[PDB]
Design a protein around this ligand. Sequence first.
Ligand SMILES: NS(=O)(=O)c1ccc(C(=O)NCc2ccc(F)c(F)c2F)cc1
Ligand SMILES: NS(=O)(=O)c1ccc(C(=O)NCc2ccc(F)c(F)c2F)cc1
Ligand SMILES: [Hg+2]
Ligand SMILES: [Zn+2]
Length: 258
Amino acid sequence: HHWGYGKHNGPEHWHKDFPIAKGERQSPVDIDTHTAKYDPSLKPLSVSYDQATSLRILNNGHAFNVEFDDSQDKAVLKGGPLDGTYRLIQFHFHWGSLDGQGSEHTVDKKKYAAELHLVHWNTKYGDVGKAVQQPDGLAVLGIFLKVGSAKPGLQKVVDVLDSIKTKGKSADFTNFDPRGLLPESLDYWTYPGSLTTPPLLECVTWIVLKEPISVSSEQVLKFRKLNFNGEGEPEELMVDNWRPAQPLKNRQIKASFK
Ligand SMILES: NS(=O)(=O)c1ccc(C(=O)NCc2ccc(F)c(F)c2F)cc1
Ligand SMILES: NS(=O)(=O)c1ccc(C(=O)NCc2ccc(F)c(F)c2F)cc1
Ligand SMILES: [Hg+2]
Ligand SMILES: [Zn+2]
């Protein structure tokens, strides 16, 4: 009775209620490193997350989101392929049932254990709702997660998951600094795309970082214990909440490095 990632309502069925699923600028895509164009005019990214205000964490079925106060320019993204200022509103992850899968975007067909999406909207449009009606309304910063050593800054997240085990649950999540989730380098690939979950609006500028961050098997293991289901319904573990790569079509993937 609604979309999901299961056999009967997963990615292959989405086109029936969301026609745009077969559009020209659908995400995610596979990043072929030998075909991306090095664009020396691309500006360096400017991540200003020093006044970031996290407020809440919630399991909305699909995944879990950490929400941010976006009433003012407190956490912004600018630079890169962007024009104007973009406010951070929320972040979430996509992960798999095994370490060899989980990411949405792939690099040379290589899948990672998980992928972080830091969602921003264009301030020019006044509100999030208006921004999703424009070709350049959103900007999502994608980061790959590979299994290795633990990431200190991710632990705060891992510890609270127990309280939002089922759909609809939320918990206060203040004073979280998102700068703990960035890799050392800000080198990236960029391309025009869409949201990777319904309604699949083609209103996003994707910025995927080259350097993945590493997380322990223990940290990823805790992601896998969440539930798609709400309290009292049959248990359905939250894993493989990822959409398979889509055809690139009339698009060019640019690289900010050589
Ligand atoms: N100012 S606040 O902290 O209370 C706030 C935080 C999150 C959201 C939210 O996630 N709504 C969905 C939503 C709708 C459209 C978009 F483009 C989004 F990025 C998005 F998160 C809305 C308000
Ligand atoms: N995986 S991803 O980064 O692409 C992604 C990011 C944000 C959202 C979201 O905020 N959903 C709510 C939502 C609800 C109705 C709309 F019209 C929206 F545009 C909208 F984003 C969905 C997918
Ligand atoms: Hg749009
Ligand atoms: Zn996402």
